[PDB]
From TrEMBL:
Its biological purpose: Component of a complex that binds and activates STK11/LKB1. In the complex, required to stabilize the interaction between CAB39/MO25 (CAB39/MO25alpha or CAB39L/MO25beta) and STK11/LKB1.
Family: Belongs to the Mo25 family.
Organism: Danio rerio (Zebrafish)
Protein name: Calcium-binding protein 39
Subunit text: Component of a trimeric complex composed of STK11/LKB1, STRAD (STRADA or STRADB) and CAB39/MO25 (CAB39/MO25alpha or CAB39L/MO25beta): the complex tethers STK11/LKB1 in the cytoplasm and stimulates its catalytic activity.
Encoding gene per record: cab39
């Protein structure tokens, strides 16, 4: 054992033993022994053996066991699970991606990957496999459109700034990789998402505040999200926050807020409560953007943007 079917069964059987001592050590030894040969199969110090290993992992449900029992495997083992999972995920048979097709009928794997962020010993592992899953649109849809997507807002506000930071990479990708899927989601779930997104903009975690601010701007810049940008830059309270984040203590918060603020002003069809705020603050803004990070410069698109914004406020 030798040959994929036997390796999978040996891995399956020992993980079971671990789900239950002293007999656990030999099982972990046999788990590691099986994971090492599984990587060996994928590489090889044979194409169909990889195709067989793939087929056997599906049938055994071992892809689900390994995610469900990830805390039972050791440090070096958890990463081997991550690597193998991620290899099989990209396997192709023509224009078909079987593992994605498989995962659509085995969706609990995805849900037990998102839920893994609440388990510090496996959070980073789960996040790594999850970002790989959601690279594929059907898997991203399931994740994004689940009610458990909103758990992300909790995961990034964590007190573990490496877990929280990793969760944001996944949160961020889901909202940006598959544009249409992401745009449909935001339009349909606007009020709730942005009611939660504002909370990210007041974070005690600085990294979460800046990175959220940077993302807000990028979203507002993408076409697909046009309907969302228009609705966004139509609320006085949202603008009131962005001019307020412009005067923030942090140089970088000011800069990221700028790229959100910039969209508010360039809007031709402003609403009265948006227009009134700009007129009432016309002279203050014209003076402000004239002294705003001129030391930066070199960004050249930034300098020209300031010139554009100042001209705009003047011609209101």
């Amino acid at each position: 054992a030798m040959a994929p079917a036997d390796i999978v069964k040996n891995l399956k059987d020992n993980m079971t033993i671990l789900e239950k001592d002293k007999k656990a050590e030999k099982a972990s030894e046999e788990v590691s022994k099986s994971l090492l040969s599984m990587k060996e199969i994928l590489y090889g110090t044979q194409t169909e053996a990889v195709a067989q290993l793939a087929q056997e992992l599906y049938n055994s449900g071992l892809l689900s066991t390994l995610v469900a029992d990830l805390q039972l495997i050791d440090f070096e083992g958890k990463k081997d699970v991550a690597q193998i999972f991620n290899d099989i995920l990209r396997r192709q048979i023509g224009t078909r991606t079987p593992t994605v097709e498989y995962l659509c009928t085995q969706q609990n794997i995805l849900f037990m990957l998102l839920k893994g962020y609440e388990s510090p010993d496996i959070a980073l592992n789960c996040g790594i496999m999850l970002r790989e899953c959601i690279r594929h649109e059907p898997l991203a849809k399931i994740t994004l459109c689940s009610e458990q997507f909103y758990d992300f807002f909790r995961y990034v506000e964590m007190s573990t700034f490496d877990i929280a930071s990793d969760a944001f990479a996944t949160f961020k990708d889901l909202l940006t990789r598959h544009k249409v899927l992401s745009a449909e989601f935001l339009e349909q779930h606007y009020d709730r998402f942005f009611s939660e997104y504002e909370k990210l903009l007041h974070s005690e975690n600085y990294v979460t505040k800046r990175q959220s601010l940077k993302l807000l701007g990028e979203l507002l810049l993408d076409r697909h999200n046009f309907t969302i940008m228009t609705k966004y830059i139509s609320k006085p309270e949202n603008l009131k926050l962005m001019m307020n984040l412009l005067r923030d203590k942090s140089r970088n918060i000011q800069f990221e807020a700028f790229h959100v603020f910039k969209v508010f002003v360039a809007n031709p069809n402003k609403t009265p409560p948006i227009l009134d705020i700009l007129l009432k603050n016309q002279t203050k803004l014209i003076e402000f953007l004239s002294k705003f990070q001129n030391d930066r410069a070199e960004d050249e698109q930034f300098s020209d943007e300031k010139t554009y914004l100042i001209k705009q406020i003047r011609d209101l």
